[PDB]
A paper describes a structure:
Voltage-gated sodium channels are transmembrane proteins responsible for the generation of action potentials in excitable cells and play important roles in the propagation of electrical impulses throughout nerves. They are complexes of a pore-forming α subunit and auxiliary β subunits, designated β1/β1B–β4 (encoded by SCN1B–4B). In addition to the channel modulation, the β subunits function as cell adhesion molecules. In this study, we determined the crystal structures of the mouse and human β4ex proteins containing all three Cys residues, which revealed the formation of a dimer in a parallel arrangement, mediated by the intermolecular disulfide bond and the exchange of the N-terminal segments.
In this study, a slightly different all-Cys construct of the mouse β4ex protein with a C-terminal tag sequence was prepared. This sample was crystallized under different conditions than those employed in the previous analysis, and the crystal structure was determined in the cubic crystal form at 3.1-Å resolution. The same parallel arrangement was also observed in the previous monoclinic crystal form in addition to the anti-parallel arrangement. The anti-parallel arrangement was not observed in the cubic and hexagonal crystal forms, probably because PEG fragments were bound to the trans homophilic interface (hexagonal form) and because detergent was used for the crystallization and the C-terminal tag sequence was present (cubic form) (see “Experimental Procedures”). The parallel arrangement of the β4 molecules was mediated, in common, through two types of interactions. First, the β4ex structure forms the intermolecular disulfide bond (the S–S interaction) between the “unpaired” Cys residue (Cys58) in the loop connecting strands B and C. Second, the N-terminal segment Ser30-Val35, which is deleted in another structure of β4ex, is involved in an intermolecular interaction between the two β4ex molecules in the parallel arrangement. This type of interaction is designated hereafter as the N–N interaction. Moreover, in this N–N interaction, the N-terminal segments form hydrogen bonds between their Glu32 and Ser34 with Ser56 and Thr54, respectively, and join the β sheets of the counterparts.
Residue numbers in the entry:
A (entry chain A): 30 to 106, 111 to 135, 140 to 155
B (entry chain B): 30 to 104, 111 to 135, 143 to 162
The structure:
């Protein structure tokens, strides 16, 4: 089997007020334990946590524990931890980091540029 | 043995006259040899295979076989090509396939103002 992909980092442009999906799927040929992940947000000034979560196993799916932005929604059918950020605002521009945990310490980065409707 | 990806498709906005890196990476959990890869360019006016070659294995750098113009070169085994001195004509769909799926990059060449309206 093979897993060809674009990489861990991509840039994405989205219209203010719309919804945007920040993608992250992960793969292990190992098979695994409980598997921890989290979405953080960064800019020049500060950084906040968006959601954290767990996949009980490859046979189950990614489920969320912590949620600090009600606009975040995690849904996807490679297990996929992509999230859908709704009700976009201009201050949502920044870097969205998705970190994963069975050592393991792999992260995916999404640079999100919010633009106006013209 | 944990790999993360932001998908098999992305869009890339690139600056005219600048240089862009078109990313493709592949993972496997078996050792592989003679893994053949190709890059194809698809445009409204034309379709063409950019470059191809093989990664002999995880040991070595990839060996390019079919070469494209002067202006595509090659860089967790990494197949990403670098496109230098972009021109608007380079806009199109760049697809990287690894023969035994593929990653698709939709490259839009643009230009940027120095600033926004009236800076300090």
């Amino acid at each position: 089997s093979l897993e060809v992909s674009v990489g861990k980092a991509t840039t994405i442009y989205a219209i203010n007020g719309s919804s945007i999906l920040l993608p992250c799927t992960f793969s292990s040929c190992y098979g695994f334990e409980n598997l921890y992940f989290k979405w953080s947000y960064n800019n020049s000034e500060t950084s906040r946590i968006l959601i954290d979560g767990i996949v009980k196993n490859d046979k189950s799916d990614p489920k969320v524990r912590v949620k600090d932005d009600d606009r975040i929604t995690l849904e996807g059918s490679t297990n996929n931890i992509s999230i859908l950020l709704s009700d976009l605002e201009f201050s949502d521009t920044g870097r969205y980091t998705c970190f994963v945990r069975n050592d393991l310490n792999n992260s995916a980065t999404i640079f999100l540029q919010v633009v106006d409707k013209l």
